[PDB]
């Protein structure tokens, strides 16, 4: 936001904010999608007591 | 990291330019300052000068200061030293050195070049003479045998020579270029083999006389009067 | 003229990537292991 002599007045950058965001995705991936997959477990409920 | 390749004749008439270049592999030229250094065989080594392998200032020993002109190159990777009105005493090995940046500091020619034989033509340059030595009994240890190869008559020097192309390397030793009366230079590369192989092979001693471009994979041979 | 003084940090002309948090890759100059996956192979 400046204030000039001409009036009042804002701009935005990328430059910086592209930089910002990207890290964000970044570590938006780093923890979405990647998963483990576990395909036989050991039961997890019992309905008798052994 | 970095290594360099130093190129250049081995020989040049007296009173005539000296051209050298070296090489840099690994690293940016662009990032470091680079000097030449001076050595005769066995008597003391001296600085050159050097240049700014960035920008091309450059300084030079006040001795070869006019004496001396060493160049660069962005382009190529390279870097050049232009010795003009050389003596006969200027004989001598090169280098290519890496400097540090600061124009007073410490730590100067951390890297070397692998180092460039450069003698005045003198005489006429001419082809090695490659004599083959026949192992005899009086040449023969327990253990070994003496196979010799002489490299007489050539000029200039050196002449770097190969044993079955570097197949052999135990006991071999290449004894140092020889100033005969000839007023031409000469030597051998000794091998040493064991004793239980003589009369089986024929063994092979290979010439490398790099600016005649001269392969003498000439064997070694027992003949009768 | 006029003196000038400008400060910096050394590299090196060969470094290796790391895995960080802040960005998955970077380059760092010197680097080590902290997996050993190889074996003398015998007891
Ligand atoms: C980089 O830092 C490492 C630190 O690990 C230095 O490596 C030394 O040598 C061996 C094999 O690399 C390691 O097992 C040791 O931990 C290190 N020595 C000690 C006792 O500290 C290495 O010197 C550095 N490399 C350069 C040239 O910067
Ligand atoms: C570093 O080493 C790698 C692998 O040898 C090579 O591809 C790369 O060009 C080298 N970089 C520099 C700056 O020497």
């Known amino acids: 936001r400046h204030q000039n002599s001409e009036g009042r007045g804002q701009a935005a950058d990328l430059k910086s904010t592209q930089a910002a965001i990207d890290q964000i995705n970044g570590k938006l991936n780093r923890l979405i999608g990647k998963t483990n997959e576990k395909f036989h477990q050991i039961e997890k409920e019992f309905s008798e007591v052994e | 990291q970095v290594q360099l390749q130093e190129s250049g004749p081995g020989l040049v008439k007296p009173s005539e330019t000296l051209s050298l270049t070296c090489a840099v592999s690994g690293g940016t030229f662009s990032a470091y300052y680079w000097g030449w250094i001076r050595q005769p065989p066995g008597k003391g080594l001296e600085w050159i000068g050097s240049?700014?392998?960035?920008?091309?200032?450059?300084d030079y020993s006040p001795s070869l200061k006019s004496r001396a002109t060493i160049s660069r190159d962005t382009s190529k990777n390279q870097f050049s030293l232009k010795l003009t009105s050389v003596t006969a005493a200027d004989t001598a090995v090169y280098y290519c050195?890496?400097?540090?940046?600061?124009?007073?500091?410490?730590?100067?020619?951390?890297?070397w070049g692998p180092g460039v034989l450069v003698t005045v033509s003198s005489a006429s340059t001419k082809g090695p003479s490659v004599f083959p030595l026949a192992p005899c009994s009086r040449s023969t240890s327990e253990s070994t045998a003496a196979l010799g190869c002489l490299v007489k008559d050539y000029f200039p020097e050196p002449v770097t020579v190969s044993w079955n192309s570097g197949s052999l390397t135990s006991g071999v030793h290449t004894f140092p270029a020889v100033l005969q009366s000839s007023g031409l230079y000469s030597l051998s590369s000794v091998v040493t083999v064991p004793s239980s192989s003589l009369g089986t092979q024929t063994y092979v001693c290979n010439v490398n006389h790099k600016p005649s471009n001269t392969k003498v994979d000439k064997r070694v041979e027992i003949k009768t009067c | 003229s006029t003196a000038t003084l400008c400060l910096g940090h050394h590299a090196v002309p060969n470094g290796t990537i790391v895995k960080t948090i802040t960005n998955d890759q970077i380059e760092v100059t010197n680097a080590t292991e902290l997996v050993q996956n190889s074996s003398i192979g015998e007891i």
């Open positions: 050195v890496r400097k540090y940046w600061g124009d007073y500091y410490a730590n100067w020619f951390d890297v």
């Open positions: 240049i700014s392998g960035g920008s091309g200032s450059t």
